Design a protein around this ligand. Structure first.
Ligand SMILES: O=C(O)c1ccc[n+]([C@@H]2O[C@H](COP(=O)([O-])O)[C@@H](O)[C@H]2O)c1
Ligand SMILES: O=C(O)c1ccc[n+]([C@@H]2O[C@H](COP(=O)([O-])O)[C@@H](O)[C@H]2O)c1
Lengths: 394, 383
């Protein structure tokens, strides 16, 4: 498989001052095509370094895509750079110059001379119309290779790109992907269970991406390889997969509650309201979620029904059970979740950061799970939230 | 001026399945130093391409930083790629092995075979202790150049990178940033070395950056022009400002939240030491729950109102016995409530001398409305 290279031009994208979503979007849009994306670049607004990256990228790929640096500032050097890298000269197109003039004249303004550049092209570039902005793009065909320049702003470039893409004559390859979301299983366990199913090849591949919400397993490549390989992996992970694709844990909880016609409530400590936050992230949460308490202080725990004898060991399975049972009784809900633990940095009751109990109570009784999460304060609180949510959807 | 090269390693990074903020964060941390950053890369999880990019980045740079691919899986190939790109062999270090093993034992687990590979380094590498993961980092000093390997997730690599960065003995340049964070005043009114305004959910930030001498003076001037609007600087957050008030006063705080759904209590407890003052909260998501925690029956058909906001704050104050209490009620969206558009939000504070309400019409989606609500509630105590 040949390569596609993708370059976002702009100094501020380096620093994350503007978030570079362009290169990623452009890469997703190449999924249906038999091309390999090994890398993406963000390059500063200087012509020499940029000309070198274009030149290197173009030497290795069948396709090169640039995004941004087509404005009228001294910081807009993309045209020059592509010009310098490909050995062709910049020529003024009088016609396009008129069109730029016309864009300004439709707003009562004369065209600044700054914008004169924006009408240059190289012999090998045909133009791509930008009815939505000043800078029109280029399509270079040369040596059996395509190079495309796009404006940075997404509303300007999405339509141009969607339009020139089908035209580039790139090699199609039916593509699929399956995203499997698990919980309660680590990366190395998944490795072991899958063994040889952990394929990393040109036709199909598998990878894992540990998240606060459990380990995600993505299979991606040729349609027919992904289908059968992914189903085999789902089989191996049957009990730990809680959802697929866009599915989220809060969403999963919501469908169980609708299915049962059941209600839920919460009693939270270390997480501090974050579990309720997460439950209510999903539109429609007021149909089942009665509410919850955040019992951050000992006094608050005693007030909301944690038994006095447990108040010296709030970080325990017994307390988590009591908390969830208490919430259930206090809210009259079919289910209740509870969280108790140590987020860190400080220990509590002689237990170290990441010590966490999550409990579910319901009609037929209660259950508790124990974790030792690594992470800082924010991380432990987050994993606790998904841990509590996992109790309901295993 | 010598180069610094920055590579985020993850196929998911190419496709923005996760957004690459790592490379940019590293790049911004490097601003006080006299290196140029000409580009940053995201590389797929493939050993050969990655060795090529590493080899190349090393040949042109004074500093190379990599982030990601230190896990135990077949897709984690950063250590193999760098070994390759530096013509050195990977060698198990039995001391680190015992440390990962200790790590797993502490969690009541046996160390899985796949983790063994995380104790492997090249002879040129020094370990960077990972206080929060199994994968320590690498620091290679070779030919006056540095290459630093870091874990992908920020809670792991942040302190590592902090610890390691002064130690690289980079040439300094006198650059600085000063962030002044405001509440209750739009960009336009503010306008009335470089200076920028940045609108955030916690308010418009005024940023001053450039030559440290220029930044320090010009920033003390700006602060003065906006002396009433500026609630903090630098790393200060609304939650921390609130904490500072509660300790200064020896006061306590509690909350009753509905649309924000627990996010306010979450924000409050984001900061270490919250339990010295934050007694707790109620998430009154349903009407039945409002009733039960002391909101008057009379107000239950008008939950989106100043009256209900007031009652919620009084009800939290009485229920928990706190000095102060915050409340939120309103419409986050996508759905209207009781004829009120998304963005209609009432935040309330009750204390010793009574209660106050602020009404807001907040633009944005469900999450955005909830976030701004949380900060508006906090702003009651610190603006
Ligand atoms: O703040 C409130 O009083 C309040 C309490 C519960 C729900 N809401 C809003 O109710 C609307 C329906 O909520 P939900 O959770 O079913 O999406 C939605 O716009 C929520 O923001 C608002
Ligand atoms: O879940 C709990 O029982 C609980 C309640 C209050 C505090 N903690 C934890 O104990 C320490 C409390 O400190 P802090 O930073 O909230 O003052 C810290 O590790 C919190 O995560 C934990």
């Amino acid at each position: 498989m040949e390569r596609a290279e993708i370059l976002g031009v702009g100094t501020e994208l380096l620093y994350g001052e503007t978030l570079d979503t362009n290169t990623a979007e452009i890469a997703r849009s190449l999924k249906p095509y038999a091309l390999k994306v090994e890398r993406t670049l963000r390059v500063a607004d200087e012509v020499a370094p940029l000309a070198r990256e274009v030149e290197e990228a173009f030497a290795r790929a069948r396709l090169v895509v640039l995004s941004g640096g087509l404005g009228p500032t001294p910081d807009d050097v993309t045209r020059e750079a592509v010009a310098l890298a490909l050995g062709e000269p910049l020529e003024l197109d009088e016609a396009v110059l008129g069109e730029i003039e016309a864009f300004f004249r439709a707003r009562g303004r004369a065209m600044p001379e700054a914008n004169r550049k924006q009408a240059m092209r190289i012999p090998s570039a045909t133009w791509l119309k930008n009815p939505r902005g000043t800078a029109p793009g280029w399509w270079v065909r040369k040596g059996g290779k395509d190079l495309v320049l796009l404006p940075g702003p997404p509303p300007e470039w999405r339509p141009m790109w969607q339009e020139v893409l089908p035209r580039l004559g790139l090699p199609r390859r039916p593509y699929a992907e399956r995203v499997l979301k698990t919980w309660g299983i680590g990366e190395s366990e998944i490795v072991e269970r899958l063994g040889p199913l952990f394929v990393r090849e040109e036709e199909v591949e598998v990878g894992t991406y540990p998240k606060v919400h459990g380990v995600e397993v993505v299979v991606r490549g040729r349609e027919d390889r992904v289908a059968e390989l992914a189903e085999r992996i789902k089989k191996k992970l049957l009990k730990e997969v809680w959802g697929e694709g866009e599915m989220t844990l809060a969403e999963a909880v919501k469908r169980r509650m609708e299915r049962e016609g059941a209600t839920l409530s919460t009693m939270e400590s270390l997480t501090g309201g974050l579990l309720g936050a997460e439950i209510t992230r999903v539109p429609g949460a007021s149909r089942f979620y009665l509410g919850g308490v955040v019992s951050y202080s000992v006094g608050a725990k005693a007030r909301f029904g944690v038994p006095q004898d447990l108040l010296s060991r709030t970080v325990s399975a017994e307390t988590a059970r009591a908390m969830a049972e208490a919430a259930r009784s206090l809210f009259g809900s079919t289910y209740a979740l509870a969280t108790t633990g140590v987020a860190g940095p400080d220990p509590l009751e002689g237990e170290p950061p990441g010590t966490v109990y999550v409990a579910l109570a319901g009609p037929t009784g209660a259950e508790v799970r124990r974790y030792r999460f690594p992470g800082d304060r924010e991380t432990v609180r987050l994993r606790s939230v998904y841990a509590a949510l996992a109790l309901l959807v295993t």
